[PDB]
């Protein structure tokens, strides 16, 4: 069978249908708006205690408690307000590449390079956190995990596959396939009905969590997508790649809307997160710094320059009150 | 209000207790569940080796998890699909990766078609050949060593070092040398 010409003519039809819907660019629309100006954020807090590089961090829904994972094998919950460590969970495998805080606040998931997503229960009767569940159905390293509720969790693995589990029974409810590279990150929509995932094949796919199908696929990047995050509206998202460029895609337009790149920026991107209103786009780079882009004018609005090593993770509170950046330097800094 | 302070005190006590164990172990990646660990001990020093199985053949993303290890054990396979050239390319990628440029590499080495220059290569007389050994196999071994040193010496930056060989005592001594070189570079003496 040689239907590859059928495949290429179909993708060409897709490209022309995308071109027909492209009236103009986001710049021609947001050419008259006023720039946000110089955004200067000071390091309000510096959490210390991790003995190794922090790979991931996550805020709780109360904006006070944050969980950070380090490859010393320790998951620590910090009350960002008073810098005190609320919890310090010791992990079985030390290469935790992803940590998630449940929205209710009772559980924390962690995983990476052990093919297992471990769910730890916090609000326990014995007064000591313990392994609640061990989800083991993946064949590649866990790159990201996110809670839907206390009973459902979505994960993405290095085996080019996402999964939706049932934590109570501990078995894969749904399996999302279609990527051709390591899925490096995922992002749950605000309504949680959909979630987008970026992989190492320079493509980002949108999955309906209720079914198992792939709604849309987005291209435009030239290298591996390392970070992804929905717009607070839920109708667009942003991806960072190794080509030192952010791309803002729109779901209803099916094509990319904005590109954020400077000629003096030649280092990849490790983390991306919008602010509360979506006007700013915070992206951590390999230059050891973060950049705050104007997500409408595509012009750099600021640079958070306090890290001595590559920024690994980046998160923004649900109320947009602080920005927590972790790093291979082993220190989490809260910016405001 | 205040109970959080005693909780934090106990937690930092546990953390200071764990830091002594963490800084006392030497992590080692082995490149031939999701990762197989192995604790062993030499001269009361606890080494922790990790051979990573059940992963795909794409390494460019998870290899970055092993830049803070003491050394990367690198076992090549020559004694098919020309496996030695693939090992050379993998070693080159590891040597020139911007995150693994500070991680040393221990090389364990446990044909003229894929390398015609081997048909015109002379064994250096400065070698150390053990008796009862075919000149052919020692010539091949030193040729592979030179092919790997042609990559490990063309560098221009990075704090990495190469320790080729031709069994845990060699890894122990090489980690000791790595630690000595790191301490020397901390005082800017090297």
């Amino acid at each position, epitope marked *: 069978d040689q239907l590859r010409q059928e495949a290429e003519q179909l993708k060409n039809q897709i490209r022309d249908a995308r071109k027909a819907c492209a009236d103009a660019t986001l710049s021609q629309i947001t050419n008259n708006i006023d720039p946000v100006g110089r955004i200067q954020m000071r390091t309000r807090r510096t959490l210390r205690g991790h003995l190794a590089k922090i790979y991931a961090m996550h805020w709780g829904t109360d904006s006070r408690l944050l969980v950070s994972a380090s490859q010393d094998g320790k998951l620590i919950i910090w009350d960002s307000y008073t810098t005190n460590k609320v919890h310090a969970i010791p992990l079985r495998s030390s290469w935790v590449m992803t940590c998630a805080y449940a929205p209710s606040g009772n559980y924390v998931a962690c995983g990476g390079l052990d093919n297992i997503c471990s769910i730890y229960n916090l609000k326990t009767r014995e007064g000591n956190v313990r392994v609640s569940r061990e989800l083991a159905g993946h064949t590649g390293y866990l790159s990201c995990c996110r809670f839907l509720d206390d009973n459902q969790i979505v994960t993405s693995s290095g085996d080019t596959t996402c999964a939706l589990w049932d934590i109570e029974t501990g078995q894969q409810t749904t399996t999302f396939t279609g990527h051709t590279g390591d899925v490096m990150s995922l992002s749950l929509a605000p309504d949680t009905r959909l979630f987008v995932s970026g992989a*190492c094949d320079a493509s980002a796919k949108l999955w309906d969590v209720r079914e198992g199908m792939c709604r849309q696929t987005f291209t435009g990047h030239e*290298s591996d997508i390392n970070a992804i995050c929905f717009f607070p509206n839920g109708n667009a998202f942003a991806t960072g790649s190794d*080509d*030192a460029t952010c791309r803002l895609f729109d779901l209803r337009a099916d094509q990319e809307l904005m590109t954020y790149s400077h000629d003096n920026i030649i280092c990849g991107i490790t983390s991306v997160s919008f602010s509360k209103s979506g006007r700013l786009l915070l992206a951590g780079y390999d230059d050891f710094n973060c950049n705050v882009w104007d997500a409408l004018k595509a012009d750099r609005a600021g640079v958070l320059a306090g890290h001595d090593n590559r920024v690994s993770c980046l998160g923004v509170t649900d109320d947009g009150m602080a920005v927590a950046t972790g790093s291979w330097d082993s220190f989490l800094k809260i910016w405001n | 209000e205040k109970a959080q302070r005693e909780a934090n005190k106990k937690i930092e006590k546990q953390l200071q207790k764990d830091k002594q164990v963490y800084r006392a172990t030497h992590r080692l990646l082995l490149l031939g569940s999701g990762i197989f660990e192995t604790k062993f001990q030499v001269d009361k020093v606890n080494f922790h080796m990790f051979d990573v199985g059940a992963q795909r*053949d794409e*390494r460019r993303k998870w290899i970055q998890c092993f830049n803070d290890v003491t050394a990367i054990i690198f076992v090549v396979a020559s004694s098919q699909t020309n496996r030695l050239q*693939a090992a050379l390319k993998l070693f080159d*990628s590891i040597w020139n990766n911007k995150w693994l440029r500070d991680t040393s590499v221990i090389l364990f080495l446990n044909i003229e*078609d894929y390398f015609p*220059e081997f048909a015109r290569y002379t064994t250096p007389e400065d070698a150390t050949p053990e008796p009862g050994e075919d000149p052919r196999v020692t010539r091949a071994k030193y040729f592979i060593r030179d092919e790997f040193l042609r990559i490990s010496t063309a560098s221009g930056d990075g704090r990495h070092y190469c320790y080729p060989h031709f069994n845990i005592r060699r890894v122990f001594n090489d980690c000791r040398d790595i630690i000595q070189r790191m301490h020397l570079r901390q005082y800017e003496l090297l």
Partner: nanobody
Amino acid sequence: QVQLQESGGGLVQPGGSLRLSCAASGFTFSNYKMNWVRQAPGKGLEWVSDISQSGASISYTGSVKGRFTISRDNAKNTLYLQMNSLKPEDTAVYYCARCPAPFTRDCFDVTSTTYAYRGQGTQVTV
């Protein structure tokens, strides 16, 4: 959309000569180091040749050293493998591969199966 569409090469008698072309589209051809890999009938992928961004540093595998020549053209964004004195051990599918990241001297995950940023390949049989 990384395309990496390669063409050229057919059935040529032993000792002949061919020129495999590789037109790449969807990225800046000058920022990435390019490679030629090949897959023999019933064998795993293997690395053949490479060329840097500008084109100064060039390396080949031992078997094709002196016979094959790689050359990139950044103005036309095209890779070329000029092969001559072909041997009966060169019949294979030739893929035009790309390094995953720009401005890097290392090149991971090439020669691996199910690796993106790689062309479909041309069947060069002798």
